CSV table of C-alpha atoms in Angstrom, one decimal:
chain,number,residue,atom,x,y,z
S,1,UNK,CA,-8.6,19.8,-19.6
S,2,UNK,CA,-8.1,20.0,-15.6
S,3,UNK,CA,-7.3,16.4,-15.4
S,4,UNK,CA,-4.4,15.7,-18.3
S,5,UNK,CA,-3.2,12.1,-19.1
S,6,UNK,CA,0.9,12.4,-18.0
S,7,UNK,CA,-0.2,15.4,-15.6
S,8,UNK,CA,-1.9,13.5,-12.4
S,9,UNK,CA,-1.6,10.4,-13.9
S,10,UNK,CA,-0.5,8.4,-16.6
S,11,UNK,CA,-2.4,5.5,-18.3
S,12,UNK,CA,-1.3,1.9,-18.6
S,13,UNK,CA,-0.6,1.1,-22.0
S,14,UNK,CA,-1.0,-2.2,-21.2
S,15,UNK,CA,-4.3,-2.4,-18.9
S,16,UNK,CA,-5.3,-5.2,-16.2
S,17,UNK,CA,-8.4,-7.1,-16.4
S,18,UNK,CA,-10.6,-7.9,-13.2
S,19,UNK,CA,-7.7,-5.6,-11.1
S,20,UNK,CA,-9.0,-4.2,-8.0
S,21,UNK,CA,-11.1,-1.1,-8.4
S,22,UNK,CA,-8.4,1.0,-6.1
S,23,UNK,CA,-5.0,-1.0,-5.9
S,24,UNK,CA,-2.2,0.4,-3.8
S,25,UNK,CA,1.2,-1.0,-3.7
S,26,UNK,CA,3.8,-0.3,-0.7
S,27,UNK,CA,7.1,-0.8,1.2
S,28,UNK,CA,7.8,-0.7,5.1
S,29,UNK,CA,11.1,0.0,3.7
S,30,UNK,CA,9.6,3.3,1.1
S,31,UNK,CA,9.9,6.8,2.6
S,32,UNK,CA,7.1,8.0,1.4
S,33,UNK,CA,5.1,5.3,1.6
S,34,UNK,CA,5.9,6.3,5.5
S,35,UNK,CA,5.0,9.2,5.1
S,36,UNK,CA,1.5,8.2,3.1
S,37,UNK,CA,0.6,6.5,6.0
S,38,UNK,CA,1.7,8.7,9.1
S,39,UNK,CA,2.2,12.4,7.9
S,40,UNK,CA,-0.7,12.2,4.9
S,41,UNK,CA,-3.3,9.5,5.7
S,42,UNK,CA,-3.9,8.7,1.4
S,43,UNK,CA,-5.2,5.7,1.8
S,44,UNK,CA,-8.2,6.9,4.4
S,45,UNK,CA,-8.2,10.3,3.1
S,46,UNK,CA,-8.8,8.6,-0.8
S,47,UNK,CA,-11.9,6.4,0.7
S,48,UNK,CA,-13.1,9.1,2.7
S,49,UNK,CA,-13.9,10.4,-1.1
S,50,UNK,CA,-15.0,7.2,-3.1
S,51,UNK,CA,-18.4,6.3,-3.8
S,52,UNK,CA,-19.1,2.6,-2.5
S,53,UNK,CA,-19.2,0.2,-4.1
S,54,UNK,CA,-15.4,0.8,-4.3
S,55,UNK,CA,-13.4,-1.6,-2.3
S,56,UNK,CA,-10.0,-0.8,-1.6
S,57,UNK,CA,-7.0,-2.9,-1.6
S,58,UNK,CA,-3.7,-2.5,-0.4
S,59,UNK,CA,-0.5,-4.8,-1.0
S,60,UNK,CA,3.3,-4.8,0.3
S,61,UNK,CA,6.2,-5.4,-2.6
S,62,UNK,CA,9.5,-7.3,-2.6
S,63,UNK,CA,11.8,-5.0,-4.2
S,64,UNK,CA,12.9,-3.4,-1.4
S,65,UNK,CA,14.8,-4.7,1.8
S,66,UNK,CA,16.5,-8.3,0.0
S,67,UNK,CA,15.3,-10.6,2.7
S,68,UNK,CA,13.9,-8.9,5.0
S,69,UNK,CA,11.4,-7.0,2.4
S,70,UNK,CA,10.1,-10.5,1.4
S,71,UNK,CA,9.2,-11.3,5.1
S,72,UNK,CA,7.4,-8.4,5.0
S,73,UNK,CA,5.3,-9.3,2.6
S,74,UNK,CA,4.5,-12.4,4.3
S,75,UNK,CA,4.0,-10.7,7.4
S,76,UNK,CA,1.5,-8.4,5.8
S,77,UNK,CA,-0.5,-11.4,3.9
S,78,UNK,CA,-0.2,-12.8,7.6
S,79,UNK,CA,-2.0,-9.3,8.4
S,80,UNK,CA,-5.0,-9.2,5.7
S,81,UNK,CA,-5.3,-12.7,7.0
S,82,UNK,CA,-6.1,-11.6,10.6
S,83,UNK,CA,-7.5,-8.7,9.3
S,84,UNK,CA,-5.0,-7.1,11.8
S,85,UNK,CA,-3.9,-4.2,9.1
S,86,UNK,CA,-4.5,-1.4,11.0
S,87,UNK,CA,-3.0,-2.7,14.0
S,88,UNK,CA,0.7,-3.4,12.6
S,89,UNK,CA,1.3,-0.7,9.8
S,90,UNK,CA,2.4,1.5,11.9
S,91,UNK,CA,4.6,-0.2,14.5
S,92,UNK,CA,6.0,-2.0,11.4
S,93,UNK,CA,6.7,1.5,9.6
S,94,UNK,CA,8.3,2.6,12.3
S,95,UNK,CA,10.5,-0.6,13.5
S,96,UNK,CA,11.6,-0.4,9.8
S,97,UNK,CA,12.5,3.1,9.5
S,98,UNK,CA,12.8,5.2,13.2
S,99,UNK,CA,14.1,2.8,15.6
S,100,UNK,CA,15.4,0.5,13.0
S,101,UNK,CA,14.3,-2.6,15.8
S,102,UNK,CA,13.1,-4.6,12.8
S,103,UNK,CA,15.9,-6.5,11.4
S,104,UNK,CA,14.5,-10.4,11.8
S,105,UNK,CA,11.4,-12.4,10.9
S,106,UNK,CA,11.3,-12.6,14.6
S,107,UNK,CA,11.5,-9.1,15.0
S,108,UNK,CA,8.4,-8.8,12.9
S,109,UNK,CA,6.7,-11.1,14.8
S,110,UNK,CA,7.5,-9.4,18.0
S,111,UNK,CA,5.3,-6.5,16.4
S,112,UNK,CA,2.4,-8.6,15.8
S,113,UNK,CA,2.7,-10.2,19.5
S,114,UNK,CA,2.9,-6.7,21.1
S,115,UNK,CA,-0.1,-5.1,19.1
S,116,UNK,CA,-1.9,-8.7,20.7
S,117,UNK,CA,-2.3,-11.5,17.7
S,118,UNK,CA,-1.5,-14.6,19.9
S,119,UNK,CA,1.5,-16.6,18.9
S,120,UNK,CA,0.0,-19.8,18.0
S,121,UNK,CA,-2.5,-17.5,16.2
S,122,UNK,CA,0.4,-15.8,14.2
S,123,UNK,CA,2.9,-18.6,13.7
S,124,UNK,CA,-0.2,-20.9,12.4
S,125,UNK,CA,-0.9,-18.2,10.0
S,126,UNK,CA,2.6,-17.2,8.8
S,127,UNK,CA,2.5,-21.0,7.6
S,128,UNK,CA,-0.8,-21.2,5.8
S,129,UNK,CA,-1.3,-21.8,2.4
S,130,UNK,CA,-4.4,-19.5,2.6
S,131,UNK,CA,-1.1,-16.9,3.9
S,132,UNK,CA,1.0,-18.5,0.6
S,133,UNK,CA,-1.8,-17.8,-1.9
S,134,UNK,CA,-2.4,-14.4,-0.6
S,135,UNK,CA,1.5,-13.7,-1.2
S,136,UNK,CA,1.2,-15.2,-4.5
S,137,UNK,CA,-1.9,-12.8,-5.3
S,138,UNK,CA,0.9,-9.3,-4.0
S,139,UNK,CA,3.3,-10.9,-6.3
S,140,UNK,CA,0.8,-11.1,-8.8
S,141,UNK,CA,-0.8,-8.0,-9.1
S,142,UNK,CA,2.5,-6.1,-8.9
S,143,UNK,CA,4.0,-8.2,-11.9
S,144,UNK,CA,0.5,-7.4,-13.5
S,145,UNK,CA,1.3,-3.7,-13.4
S,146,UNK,CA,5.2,-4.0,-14.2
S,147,UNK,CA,5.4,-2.3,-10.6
S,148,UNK,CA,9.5,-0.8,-10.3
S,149,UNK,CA,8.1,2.1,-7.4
S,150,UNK,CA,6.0,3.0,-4.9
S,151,UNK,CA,4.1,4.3,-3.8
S,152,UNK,CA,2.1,3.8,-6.2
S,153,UNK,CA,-1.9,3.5,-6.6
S,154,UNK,CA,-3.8,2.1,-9.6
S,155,UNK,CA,-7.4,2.5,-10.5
S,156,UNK,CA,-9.4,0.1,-12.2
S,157,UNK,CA,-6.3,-1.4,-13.6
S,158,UNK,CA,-5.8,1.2,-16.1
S,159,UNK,CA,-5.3,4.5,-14.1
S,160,UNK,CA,-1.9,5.3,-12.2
S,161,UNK,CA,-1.7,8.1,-9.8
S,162,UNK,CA,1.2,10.7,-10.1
S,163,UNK,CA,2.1,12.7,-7.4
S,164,UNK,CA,4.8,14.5,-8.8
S,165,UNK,CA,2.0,16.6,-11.0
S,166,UNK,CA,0.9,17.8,-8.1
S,167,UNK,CA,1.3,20.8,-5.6
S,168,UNK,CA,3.6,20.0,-2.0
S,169,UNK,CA,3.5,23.1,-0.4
S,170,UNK,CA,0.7,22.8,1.3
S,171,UNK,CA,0.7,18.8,2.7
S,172,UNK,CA,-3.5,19.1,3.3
S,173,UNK,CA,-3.9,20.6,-0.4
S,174,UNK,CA,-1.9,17.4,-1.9
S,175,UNK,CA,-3.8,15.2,-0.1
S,176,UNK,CA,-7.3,16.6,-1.6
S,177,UNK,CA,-5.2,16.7,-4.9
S,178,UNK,CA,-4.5,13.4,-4.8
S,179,UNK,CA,-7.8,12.0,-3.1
S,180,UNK,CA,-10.1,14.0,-5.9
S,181,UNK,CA,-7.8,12.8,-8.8
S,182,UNK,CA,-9.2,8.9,-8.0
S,183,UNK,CA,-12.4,9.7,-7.4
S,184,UNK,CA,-12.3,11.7,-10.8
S,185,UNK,CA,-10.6,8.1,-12.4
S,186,UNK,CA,-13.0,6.0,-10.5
S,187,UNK,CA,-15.8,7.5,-12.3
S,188,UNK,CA,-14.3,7.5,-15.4
């Protein structure tokens, strides 16, 4: 077949009920996650090519970064809280890994001040329990999944991408790779 089971992605042996349709797990602190979000675009580039219907979902881990990595996954339920996502991922990205000014909670703040979420409008947020539960569902769906790398991207809870079956010459040809392999797993 064109599309093998262990060739562009494997299949959970252990699937998840009522998972998001296309799940995608990440680390500010993951090279290439930084690289899936500045060099390769995935994530836009994948929904570019789903039917709808399809909602995407995309959640920060703990496992990388001790402290710091579990502030960032406050900060970015603090961010699908605002609805501010595309207005911190890449400032955070590159805090985190090019000019390595991210080192504090505050720090991380300081990016969500600059890109323009008021203070009182963050700091009331970063203490929410609507901001708690949306950490608890990150935590969740990554234990779900038994989640030890990223990137990684899941489809209907029973599909997981793998980019190392694909081609990386070409940087545009992986992307197409990887963005027609879930809409081939979305409609199966």
């Amino acid at each position: 077949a064109q599309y093998e089971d262990g060739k562009q992605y494997t299949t959970l042996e252990k699937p998840v009920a009522g998972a998001p349709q296309v799940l995608e797990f990440f680390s500010f602190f993951c090279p290439h996650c930084y690289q899936f979000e500045e060099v390769l675009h995935i994530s836009d580039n994948v929904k570019k090519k789903l039917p709808e219907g399809v909602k995407m979902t995309k959640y920060h881990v703990n496992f990388m970064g001790g402290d710091l990595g579990k502030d960032l996954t406050q900060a970015w339920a603090v961010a699908m809280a605002l609805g501010v996502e595309d207005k911190v991922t890449v400032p955070l990205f590159e805090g985190v890994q090019k000019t390595q000014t991210i080192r504090s909670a505050s720090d991380i703040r300081d990016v969500f001040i600059n890109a323009g979420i008021k203070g009182e409008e963050y700091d009331a947020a970063w203490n929410s329990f609507v901001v708690k539960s949306l950490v608890a569902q990150q935590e969740k769906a990554a234990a779900d999944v038994q989640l030890r790398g990223v990137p990684a991207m899941f489809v209907n809870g029973k599909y997981q991408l793998n980019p190392q079956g694909m081609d990386t010459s070409n940087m545009d040809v992986f992307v197409q790779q990887y963005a027609d392999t879930v809409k081939y797993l979305s409609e199966k």
